[PDB]
Write a protein that binds this ligand. Structure first.
Ligand code: NDP
Ligand code: NDP
Ligand code: 4IS
Lengths: 287, 287
């Protein structure tokens, strides 16, 4: 296993360093809050005295930060020592800001590989976990084996915005579902039910979603938005029932209103008798 | 096999009447649009000439209509024939609208059992299908074997609104995730990707949800919103990345703005360093 530097020891960076040490990588770590490296150092990781010494320790520099602005904040001061470094940035951001980070790293002699990890910290090091990757192909292939300690690698192409784009595509569904979980837990709590009580039914419900994803994928892709499978107005009534159920129980209705508002836009566009999938045509229009 | 009356012959009512005839129940049917009964009548079902005749024909009256307002419009003129009847209303509506329906049936001498069927019409009669049930237990247990012809019976309690409550709790996450899928498709299409291209990742994202449902269940229930797995402020950045990725790609931001606003309410209320799950405290009914 090759040596490498890991900068950023939040929940994902910690899980990353432990998986790299489990594999035997010679690991050099640095974190703004130095306290968070103590456990990794006790396992054998090398604590870098500064962020510049961390970058200087290895060719491979893995970042796990909040966004790409944090990369400039951490790497900016010693940016003149980034020449010849491979920076694998595993931080979420937009495709545009991901490309800007790649341009900035190139200006200073390094090369950036963009990554999007699709697993929680407990999934790091597990072969069922995956991460999108995009950036220079030669630099990626050269360090793929090291990156495969963390997750399976899904290389998407040269453009760094690709891995970020694929990450956001899955994350918009993920956050939508998880906030709906909190909304369902909030409704349950208003009626004397715990998250543990609704957990089996909530799990059963989302576990059946892939069949609907497959059913509607090919319908959306051929432009088949006919109301033969479902009628949008019937979905409006369904989401109106959710909203008013929430309101009757005194639970917040900000997100249920937003969902109802989109169905109302669907009906305002004349899609009442078409499938609810027709709202993808509204969602494609800007603003 | 006990005889019963079925009113409401949409796709759900059709599958129900067929399942009842399959098992051998004597079936009296009525629908506002009489021609919808043609196939069931040719199978052996008895066509009632009027809704009043339908209600008078049997003690058990199963309803598969749009909502509870449709029950008042339909059963109103016949409200006197309701004395001694057990009305099993399988129409989806809010818990409060269901409870008002149960009081209105009681005012006219009947008893309402509320059902929440969690399967499409093709699931009616199949062994793994299920439906929540609520209402007076004795009247339910007297007709439980007949109802078990349609789905598994999941009795939830005496309060008539409980079946609707459990139905709405599951639908919250379903519509949130499916609308998030449409958002992901729109973003994908704006960047040259079809729904078929993102279907595997969207299925992986959805299928991994039960892990997070179980992970945050007891943490929410015990009030443990520690940031050991995630910080809310990191989630705020993540959903802002989605929002601005949508804007950068010229697609709609209505739902992403609503998601960002909730995270910012979490930060505004002092939860920036807690898990994102702590936003359930903002969604919960007051005091
Ligand atoms: N948490 C999860 O389950 C998942 C998150 N991700 C993504 O992975 C990334 C890592 O997130 P996560 O591990 O949760 O942790 P956080 O984003 O909460 O923090 C990660 C690290 O960023 C550092 N940091 C943030 N801002 C600055 C700054 N201005 N200057 C210096 N250091 C800074 C923190 O330093 P310090 O320790 O000093 O605070 C910390 O070590 C995010 O972009 C996230 O979207 C992807 C997969 C899943
Ligand atoms: N996938 C599904 O279909 C599922 C449906 N459900 C719930 O089951 C219920 C019925 O389902 P489904 O058959 O699909 O619904 P439909 O809306 O297709 O059927 C509505 C039925 O109610 C009748 N009706 C509506 N309004 C009135 C009125 N004002 N007066 C008299 N009759 C009226 C219609 O009669 P007419 O024929 O004359 O129009 C028809 O028989 C709904 O509440 C639905 O949400 C539950 C889960 C799954
Ligand atoms: F921002 C967050 C917060 C909590 C999380 F579990 C995540 C994850 N990304 C992929 C699923 C886990 C991201």
């Amino acid at each position: 296993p090759a040596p490498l530097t890991l900068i950023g020891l939040g929940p994902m960076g910690q899980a990353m360093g432990n998986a790299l040490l489990d594999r035997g990588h010679g690991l050099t770590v640095w974190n703004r809050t130095a306290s968070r490296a103590d456990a990794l150092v006790a396992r054998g990781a090398v604590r870098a005295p500064t962020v510049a010494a961390a970058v200087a320790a290895n060719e491979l520099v893995v970042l796990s930060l909040t966004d790409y602005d944090a990369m400039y904040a951490l790497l900016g001061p010693a940016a003149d020592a980034l020449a010849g470094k491979v920076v694998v940035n595993l931080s979420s951001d937009t495709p545009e800001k991901t490309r800007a980070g790649a341009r900035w790293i190139a200006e200073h002699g390094g090369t950036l590989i963009a990554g999007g990890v699709t697993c929680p910290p407990s999934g790091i090091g597990s072969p069922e976990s995956s991460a999108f990757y995009s950036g220079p192909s030669a630099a990626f292939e050269r360090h793929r084996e090291t990156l495969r300690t963390l997750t399976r690698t899904d290389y998407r192409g040269e453009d760094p915005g690709l891995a970020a784009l694929w990450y956001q595509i899955g994350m918009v569904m993920w956050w939508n579902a998880m906030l709906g979980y909190l909304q369902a837990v909030a409704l349950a709590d208003a009626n004397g039910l715990k998250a543990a009580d609704i957990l089996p039914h909530a799990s059963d419900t989302v576990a059946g979603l892939p069949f609907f994803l497959r059913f509607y994928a090919d319908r959306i892709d051929t432009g088949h938005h006919g109301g033969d499978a479902d009628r949008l107005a019937m979905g409006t009534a369904s989401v109106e029932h959710i909203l008013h159920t929430m309101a009757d129980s005194g639970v917040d209705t900000a997100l249920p209103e937003a969902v109802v508002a989109l169905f109302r836009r669907g009906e305002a566009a004349g899609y009442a008798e078409n499938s609810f999938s027709s709202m993808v045509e509204l969602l494609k229009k800007p603003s």
